[PDB]
Paper text:
ESCRT-III proteins mediate a range of cellular membrane remodeling activities such as multivesicular body biogenesis, cytokinesis, and viral release. Critical to these processes is the assembly of ESCRT-III subunits into polymeric structures. Budding yeast has a total of eight ESCRT-III proteins with the core subunits Vps20, Snf7, Vps24, and Vps2, as well as the accessory proteins Did2, Vps60, Chm7, and Ist1 (3). ESCRT-III proteins are directly involved in membrane remodeling and scission.
Here, we present the 3.2-Å resolution cryo-EM structure of an extended Vps24 conformation organized in a double-stranded helical filament. Using the class averages and a real-space approach, we determined the helical symmetry and found that 11.09 units per turn make up a pitch of 279 Å. The determined Vps24 structure in the filament corresponds to an elongated conformation extending to 100 Å in length. Each extended Vps24 monomer packs against another Vps24 molecule to form a domain-swapped dimer. In this domain-swapped dimer, the helical repeating unit contains two Vps24 molecules that are distanced apart by 25.2 Å in translation and 32.5° by a left-handed rotation along the helical axis, making up a single protofilament. Within the studied Vps24 filaments, the extended Vps24 conformation forms a domain-swapped dimer that makes up the basic unit of two distinct protofilaments. The tightly integrated Vps24 molecule shares buried interaction surfaces with three neighboring Vps24 molecules inside a single strand of the assembly. The N-terminal helix α0 including positive K5 and K6 points into the core of the filament. In our cryo-EM structure, we find that helix α5 binds to the hairpin formed by helix α1′/α2′ of the corresponding domain-swapped dimer. The interactions between two protofilaments are scarce (N12, K133) and give rise to solvent-accessible cavities up to 10-Å distance between the molecules from the neighboring strands.
Author numbering:
A (entry chain A), B (entry chain B), C (entry chain A), D (entry chain B), E (entry chain A): 1 to 168
């Protein structure tokens, strides 16, 4: 019945989708664990760098200087990988929705407001007399084009200072 | 079966849609005709202004100033109307598509390119071992997560100037 | 089930393909290693040619003149071989894909846009009335040929200056 | 089994495809008929213009100028339509093939010629020792990487004018 | 007949609605039970904390100190969940009504009072002479605009201290 959805997720899409979001969330928590338990190794080193900064021991600071870099080299790729999954998990939750009734109602009512703003504009009045005379008495669209009968075309305050300005 | 689309276009949407687009190009040509047949009234007036520009008759030029104003007031409301319909006819064609197979193929093939760019990032390769081990041998998604298995990573050129910089 | 794929890669194609891309990537890294470790022999010689250029020693420059050529003769074939594998590995990754669902969706949605641009052209309108009346209510193609009902054929602004130009 | 092709052509693609190509040659002949039967109205008019060219009657030639314009306005929209259908019928035949065995043999036998040109380049022979030692004795690919084993390389005529040129 | 109501609640809305309010009320009573039977475990602990507060037993209070926190941690999420369902059950009873005759009469009679307050304002009197002369003798609205004939426009006590204040 829907072939593009099965061309992406396979012969049973609804169990392929919950099979990624198991795996893509187990790895989403192992990053948040390995930044929780690796921040405290950064927090203890801030107590151990500040310890031997007042001790002024060369053999102590240069021994912490090796492990402070190798963990911050580990931190900068695990902090990156948290933003890597969140780019994947957001683009793949967008693929999972993609044709839902929830997005169909949310994107249509946001569009019917944008049509309702445009059908009341006065220069397309004479379209709406012709359009009301032709359409079926349908739902949203035909209920807008007959609700816009609140305008007639009449002359207003014209310019007189431009008539003598054309000869000028 | 199709409730949002019938709520917008009525109980038979496919004939409501071609009933608008029929009307909305009848007015699409009547604007384009009345910008064409009224430009040549502005074109003949540019000759008749240039006629009595050398005659230097105030009783001739200001008689054209009464009718040149009535055409350019008419032109600027009809030139506006061409932008009025084309704002409506573009939004009301977006409402006609809105859930089609034509949008389903277009908005998803451009979405699978964006996932193919993200699954190949080397920080999340450790996810793609676990993800390839779990998924059904599906279409697009499970064909991308094992087409990223044709690569492996290894350690590189570490910084040798970092330890003395950290103790600095 | 697919015989051309097995006529190229043998009785088990999926393990022939990952057996090349092991070998064709080990050699892809031995070139990048042997241009990394041979550039530094070119970089030290730029310190040793510039050394004895100010020393003005004939017996030093003409001894570096032998090894500068034999390494640049080595460099120019190893730099070539990097572009040799990348021509092979790109033509053989194209053979590995060649019938994938990923290329099937990417090359079809790029083609359905090219059909959508052509079916709306006005001279083939009277085809599309006949074509809509005949086709099944299918997916992408039949959803395009009934969406193009937004045009009727009517006369426009004809030429009058060519009628008296035929006698001219 | 075939999801992209059924998404384009519907649940039975093979009868949707011959249902378009049936319609799209019915109009393929009606354009070719109406360019043939309308050329002879242009052909008889070239005699009747040449009739009253020597009669020198303005009341005869300009009566043909009213009907010669109505045929060449009709001819130029029907001559355009022959290029309109042939742009559609070529693209919609490309959509019908798009994944066939006929394209799989044609696009791959032309691809194996291009790999056969690249595996015989002598800079990458050192890959083809390691590649022949690893691959299964397959079809086309492993038959090319050992049909390039009927050759060997050796050092050639070195430059004797390079050392003095480098010290120059 | 009503498509938005079926797009939300499905093909039979009236049995989807009483299928939530079964489930959403069973859970509404299991919270009120599990705060009724968990308050008495808080009430007995207030008799057991106040028991060993005068006994001054360290091994008794610190043993009740473990279970007093684990139940108040249980209480603070079950007290929250009572306010969680009542936010859901009130927003989903608002969805169930949403177009009823009961809300149609209650929101219209509250609106007709607001129109009745505004049509009697004296500056829009001259509208109501024109409006009474045009409308059909309808229900509520036309019965208000002819009931407002109890006013005529006449001059009152004008200011004289502002005439000499303009020159001032």
């Amino acid at each position: 019945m829907d072939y593009i959805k099965k061309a992406i997720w396979g012969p049973d899409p609804k169990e392929q989708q919950r099979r990624i979001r198991s795996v893509l969330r187990k790895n989403g928590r192992n990053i948040e664990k390995s930044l929780r338990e690796l921040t405290v190794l950064q927090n203890k080193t801030q107590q151990l760098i500040k310890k031997s900064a007042k001790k002024n021991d060369v053999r102590t600071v240069r021994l912490y200087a090796k492990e402070l870099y190798q963990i911050n080299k580990q931190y900068d790729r695990m902090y990156t990988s948290r933003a890597q999954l969140d780019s994947v998990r957001m683009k793949i939750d967008e693929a999972i929705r993609m044709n839902t009734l929830s997005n169909q109602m949310a994107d249509s009512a946001g569009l019917m407001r944008e049509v309702n703003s445009l059908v009341r504009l006065p220069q397309l009045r004479n379209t709406m007399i012709e359009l009301e005379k032709e359409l079926m008495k349908s739902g949203i669209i035909s209920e807008m084009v007959d609700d816009t009968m609140e305008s007639v075309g009449d002359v207003g305050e014209e310019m007189d200072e431009a008539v003598d300005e054309e000869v000028n």
